[PDB]
Amino acid sequence: GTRGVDSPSAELDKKANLLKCEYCGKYAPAEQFRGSKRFCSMTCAKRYN
Ligand SMILES: [Zn+2]
User: Record-annotated residues binding Zn(2+)?
Assistant: First the structure.
């Protein structure tokens, strides 16, 4: 597929499809938004509860 073609950070899937933690506001690949697409990973999502 066309995911990770012109990407040095191919592992992070180019970080094309970004959204960001409605807390700190850091942009990341939606895949890392394990807080059900609201916040980034553990520290942040849990901090909102
Ligand atoms: Zn965060």
Answer: 21, 24, 40, 44
